[PDB]
Nucleic acid binder design. Sequence first.
RNA 1: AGGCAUUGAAAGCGACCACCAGGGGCACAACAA
Length: 162
Amino acid sequence: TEYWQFAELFSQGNIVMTEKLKLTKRLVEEYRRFYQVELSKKPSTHAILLPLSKALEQILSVPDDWDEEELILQGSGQLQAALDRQEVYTRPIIKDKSVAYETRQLQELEAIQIFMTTCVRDLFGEMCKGDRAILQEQRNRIKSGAEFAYRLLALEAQQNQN
RNA sequence: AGGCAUUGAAAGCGACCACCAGGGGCACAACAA
């Protein structure tokens, strides 16, 4: 929380930074609807960021000619393919067998889709101006900021659930 | 030894898998005259 209050402090007069800090929390607060590694098991950064690392690696690797509205479908496909390679306990929407499979699938596909839509629309399209150089220089600062955002959301959940 | 007759239908793949982890700075120099 200390290092978040510093980011929230340096951003106070600048909209483009305040927007990026709000977006970086929202971006993970969206993927935390469908993927949750438990911090108690002492996980890697690779784990905490699995959907963000596969959203960015797909946006950056695909040819620069292709549209945002196709990038979202191929990236949500890869996220769906990647989630099916993890162990089941990390997937909040599938893991509750209390609800029917065809609706667990519908909630997973829309939770992945809305996240992939935020990464391609708001991260790449809006904030990074649709430029792969500007996203490639930010890649690692986004990943660090998202790791702190994931820990802040997890701390906030484990407190406010009382 | 003769005439004859050197083939013929069909099939031309089928299933699944298209990755996995972990790293994402490390050291120092911020003025000199």
